[PDB]
Amino acid sequence: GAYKYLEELQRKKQSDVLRFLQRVRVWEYRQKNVIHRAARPTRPDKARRLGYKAKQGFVIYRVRVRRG
Amino acid sequence: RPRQYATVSKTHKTVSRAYGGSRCANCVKERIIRAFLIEEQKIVKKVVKEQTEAAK
Amino acid sequence: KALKVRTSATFRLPKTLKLARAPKYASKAVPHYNRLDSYKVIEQPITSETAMKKVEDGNILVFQVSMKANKYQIKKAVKELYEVDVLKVNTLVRPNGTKKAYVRLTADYDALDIANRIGYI
Amino acid sequence: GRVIRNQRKGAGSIFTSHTRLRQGAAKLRTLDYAERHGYIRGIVKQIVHDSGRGAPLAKVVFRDPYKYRLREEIFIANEGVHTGQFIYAGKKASLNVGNVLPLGSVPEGTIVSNVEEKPGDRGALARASGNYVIIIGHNPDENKTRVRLPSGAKKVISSDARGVIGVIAGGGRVDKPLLKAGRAFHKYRLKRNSWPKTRGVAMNPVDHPHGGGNHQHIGKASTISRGAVSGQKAGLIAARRTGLLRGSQKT
Amino acid sequence: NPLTHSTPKNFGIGQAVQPKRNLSRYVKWPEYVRVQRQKKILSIRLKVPPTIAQFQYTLDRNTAAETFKLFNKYRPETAAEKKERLTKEAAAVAEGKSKQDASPKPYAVKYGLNHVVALIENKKAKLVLIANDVDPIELVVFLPALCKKMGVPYAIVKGKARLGTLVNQKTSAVAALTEVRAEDEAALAKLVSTIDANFADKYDEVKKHWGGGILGNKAQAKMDKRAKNSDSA
RNA sequence: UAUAGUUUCUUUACUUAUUCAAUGAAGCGGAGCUGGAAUUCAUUUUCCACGUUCUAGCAUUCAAGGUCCCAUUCGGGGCUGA
RNA sequence: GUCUAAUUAAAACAUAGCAUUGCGAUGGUCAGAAAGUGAUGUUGACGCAAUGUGAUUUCUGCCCAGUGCUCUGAAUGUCAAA
């Protein structure tokens, strides 16, 4: 199994690798629109914890909202 | 009026001269002269730079 | 291999193969019959002494007409229903809400003849 | 209490500028390549009056280097410019009036106008009638040019910044009195709605802080802080001193 | 000939309306282009951490062709041959009653990420291939360390699309071999020794070394100018 | 007073984050030719320019020319010109 | 010249003129719940904004203690959260 590794590694968020990855992906999301499609997710481990089964009829939408 | 300038003929809207119904005759004369003369003067500038750069 | 060329710094949308529709089935499955035929543009004549002076002297028919109709329709409908030829058409909206049409023929035909053929006068 | 005039002035339904007869925005040519590596010639075709503006304008015409096209610009005319006049804009251009040299290309004591404080703004400082900028000196290393601005102030801008040489036309405009509320009326009729002006001290206290009383009088002081707010700011904002000017500004 | 002339135009600054040139450099591209370009740019500028750029040290194309030839030998089956296989199996179970073993044993490549990870943690693998082009990199950043801890030989190779071509899919993100025929086990050992010299043995030092920190052409040129002018002697 | 470590703070520096402005995102940066200045202590260090200024004209047709192919034919393409 | 339409047309308001104040645009004044938002601003100190006085002539005196506005920061001063 790999989703277990993914889950623990995504828990290690103040590790250097993940905070780097975070920096990058936030740059690119921010350069994209506010509500914008994703045809695959970013955390398949998580989408699978929650109900995502990678078949036809499931959709990811990445969305950012102001803060405060 | 400017659609009667459509229904009328080329004879009414124009003269037999270059730059006919657009520019005055005297302005035409002026720019003809100016063309000829500064072309000649550009030739002269060219040959002056030519002989100078060839000497040096 | 090396890259393409580009003369203008504008990047426009490409053109793209625009398919059409012939899709799989029909939207309504029955073509509606003619919304506006002669037997609907011409409802009834008019027989007021004014319009009868007209049809007597001026060689003019006077009809009552749908609000959806126009002069081409009226002309064609008259040419069909009455086997005549028609010179011109002047229409108005009667303030009872209807349309009225003054219809002038050629000098060949006679409006009196075709009206007392129709069976009003 | 009400919202007052100075606060209504910012929404501005009626206070907007009356921008009909204005021939366009009087901006410089864009700083593309020819200007920053050589020069380029245009021609002043016609000087005209801009409404709301005391300084005239000069419809200049250039050529497009990239296309058979005749991009026309609008320059603020300096004193001496005339029709049919060749305007040379760029870096290796010659120092005569009407040209658009940069400040690293001009020497000290040079007199310019319609200057940029940031290259590519297409026109700024010294745009009004009679006014000019004076070059003071340079720092080519750390390419910076010191300039004196009509306030009397000193500023330091990119020596790659541009500016027309000479002084803006229309000078001596305010050396003449108007004599007439009607002259003022028409002037502001073409500029905007800031005329006439009522006095708060003659208003009611609902209408202005200085208003009210059984005499026209202010009460508190007319010197207000910059740490005040909308509705408190009616008078002398952040005034360091006050009254008649008894000697040198000492700036 | 005597009518043809030589005009030549001066394309300088005030003259000769400039001609068509290749402005590939000065284009207003769209946002998706800008995003992916600046994305890779930023992901080289930043000080990448060693467990990334553990990638970016990929396999040279020669041994790549070798290993892919090998895997194409040990390719899996498609639907048509699976169908006829099990038709034969039906015939044999019907007439000979061979207990689902009339067909032979297959030798094929193992693909699938969790398949492969359990294969490794059980140590049934002979070789592992890993793709570098992966967009969620978290899926694969651990596979190397795991393969090391287990003692398995791994390699990073170019093309998850290549793995997909190999394995009848679009992508695979991973591949591995666990059981091979004796006709090729020797080439397998050779290839593995080469790989282990390339990737497995250098695990410690690449794990130590931080990547990135790289600058553009304009900036590197300016740094060169400044540095040679400062160290002028 | 010198130290191998952790530490705080001051200053400075870098660009990709972020921020600002412009444009139809047109000429960025580096190097290289040419000429000039340039003194060279071998052999070149470098630095400057690298097509436009008497004149209210004109400047456009993948550029004319030069060169190489095709298939001559109506022509057609490439490189250079840049 | 203007205003209290329907009891106050005036010495009131405005006015030109005088003076002061802020602002060199990363700005001053103002607006918006917010915003990759706006007015001044198609603007640039002979300008914008804010105040006061009220043609011209002649003069605008003493007071910075108090209340405001402001300019100074080395300080056994005070002094929040972190």
Curated annotation (Swiss-Prot), chain A:
What superkingdom does the record give? Eukaryota
Q: Where in the cell is it found?
A: Cytoplasm
Oligomeric state and interaction partners are given as: Component of the large ribosomal subunit (LSU). Mature yeast ribosomes consist of a small (40S) and a large (60S) subunit. The 40S small subunit contains 1 molecule of ribosomal RNA (18S rRNA) and 33 different proteins (encoded by 57 genes). The large 60S subunit contains 3 rRNA molecules (25S, 5.8S and 5S rRNA) and 46 different proteins (encoded by 81 genes).
**Additional facts recorded:** There are 2 genes for eL15 in yeast.
Function statement: Component of the ribosome, a large ribonucleoprotein complex responsible for the synthesis of proteins in the cell. The small ribosomal subunit (SSU) binds messenger RNAs (mRNAs) and translates the encoded message by selecting cognate aminoacyl-transfer RNA (tRNA) molecules. The large subunit (LSU) contains the ribosomal catalytic site termed the peptidyl transferase center (PTC), which catalyzes the formation of peptide bonds, thereby polymerizing the amino acids delivered by tRNAs into a polypeptide chain.
Family, according to the entry, reads as follows: Belongs to the eukaryotic ribosomal protein eL15 family.
What name is this protein filed under? Large ribosomal subunit protein eL15A
The organism's lineage is: Eukaryota, Fungi, Dikarya, Ascomycota, Saccharomycotina
Report which part of the complete sequence is shown: 2 to 69 of 204
Swiss-Prot record, chain C:
- Main localization is cytoplasm
- What subcellular compartments does it reside in? Cytoplasm
The reply on keyword Transport is no
Which one of the record's GO molecular function terms can you name?
A: rRNA binding
Highest taxon in the source lineage: Eukaryota
In chain numbering, cross-link Glycyl lysine isopeptide (Lys-Gly) (interchain with G-Cter in SUMO) is at: K40
Any GO BP: ribosomal large subunit assembly
Keyword annotations for this protein, in alphabetical order, are: Cytoplasm, Isopeptide bond, Ribonucleoprotein, Ribosomal protein, RNA-binding, rRNA-binding, Ubl conjugation
Q: What is any one of the record's Gene Ontology cellular component terms?
A: preribosome, large subunit precursor
Gene3D superfamilies from the UniProt entry = 3.30.70.330
- Provide the function of this protein: Component of the ribosome, a large ribonucleoprotein complex responsible for the synthesis of proteins in the cell. The small ribosomal subunit (SSU) binds messenger RNAs (mRNAs) and translates the encoded message by selecting cognate aminoacyl-transfer RNA (tRNA) molecules. The large subunit (LSU) contains the ribosomal catalytic site termed the peptidyl transferase center (PTC), which catalyzes the formation of peptide bonds, thereby polymerizing the amino acids delivered by tRNAs into a polypeptide chain.
Q: Which family is this protein grouped under?
A: Belongs to the universal ribosomal protein uL23 family.
Q: How does it assemble?
A: Component of the large ribosomal subunit (LSU). Mature yeast ribosomes consist of a small (40S) and a large (60S) subunit. The 40S small subunit contains 1 molecule of ribosomal RNA (18S rRNA) and 33 different proteins (encoded by 57 genes). The large 60S subunit contains 3 rRNA molecules (25S, 5.8S and 5S rRNA) and 46 different proteins (encoded by 81 genes). uL23 is associated with the polypeptide exit tunnel.
Q: What is this protein called?
A: Large ribosomal subunit protein uL23
Swiss-Prot record, chain D:
- Point out the cross-link Glycyl lysine isopeptide (Lys-Gly) (interchain with G-Cter in ubiquitin) in this chain: K45, K92, K118, K144
Q: Which UniProt keywords apply?
A: Cytoplasm, Isopeptide bond, Phosphoprotein, Ribonucleoprotein, Ribosomal protein, RNA-binding, rRNA-binding, Ubl conjugation
Q: Which residues form the signal peptide?
A: none
**GO CC, alphabetical:** cytosol; cytosolic large ribosomal subunit
The UniProt entry's GO biological process terms, in alphabetical order, are:
cytoplasmic translation; maintenance of translational fidelity; ribosomal large subunit biogenesis
Q: Name one GO molecular function term.
A: structural constituent of ribosome
Q: Which Gene3D superfamilies match?
A: 2.30.30.30, Nucleic acid-binding proteins (2.40.50.140), Ribosomal protein L2, domain 3 (4.10.950.10)
Which residues are modified to Phosphoserine? Answer: S51, S94, S158, S159, S248
Main localisation: cytoplasm
Quote the subcellular location field of this record.
Cytoplasm
Quaternary organization: Component of the large ribosomal subunit (LSU). Mature yeast ribosomes consist of a small (40S) and a large (60S) subunit. The 40S small subunit contains 1 molecule of ribosomal RNA (18S rRNA) and 33 different proteins (encoded by 57 genes). The large 60S subunit contains 3 rRNA molecules (25S, 5.8S and 5S rRNA) and 46 different proteins (encoded by 81 genes).
The UniProt similarity line reads:
Belongs to the universal ribosomal protein uL2 family.
Additional comment: There are 2 genes for uL2 in yeast.
According to UniProt, the name of this protein is Large ribosomal subunit protein uL2A
UniProtKB/Swiss-Prot annotation, chain E:
Query: Which family would the database say this protein is a member of?
Result: Belongs to the eukaryotic ribosomal protein eL8 family.
Give the top-rank taxon of the lineage listed in the UniProt record for this protein: Eukaryota
Q: Where does it reside? A: Cytoplasm
Can you cite a GO biological process for this protein?
cytoplasmic translation
Q: What else is known?
A: Present with 238000 molecules/cell in log phase SD medium. There are 2 genes for eL8 in yeast.
User: PANTHER family from the entry?
Assistant: RIBOSOMAL PROTEIN L7AE FAMILY MEMBER
Is the keyword Cytoplasm assigned to this protein? Answer: yes
Signal peptide residues on this chain, from the entry's feature table: none
Name of this protein: Large ribosomal subunit protein eL8A
Q: How does it assemble?
A: Component of the large ribosomal subunit (LSU). Mature yeast ribosomes consist of a small (40S) and a large (60S) subunit. The 40S small subunit contains 1 molecule of ribosomal RNA (18S rRNA) and 33 different proteins (encoded by 57 genes). The large 60S subunit contains 3 rRNA molecules (25S, 5.8S and 5S rRNA) and 46 different proteins (encoded by 81 genes).
Q: Which organism is it from?
A: Saccharomyces cerevisiae (strain ATCC 204508 / S288c) (Baker's yeast)
Question: What Gene Ontology molecular function terms does this protein carry?
Answer: RNA binding; structural constituent of ribosome
One GO cellular component this record assigns the protein to is:
cytosolic large ribosomal subunit
Q: Name one Pfam family in it.
A: Ribosomal_L7Ae
The UniProt entry, under PROSITE patterns, shows: RIBOSOMAL_L7AE (PS01082)
Presence of the UniProt keyword Cell membrane in the record = no
- UniProt entry keywords in alphabetical sequence: Cytoplasm, Ribonucleoprotein, Ribosomal protein
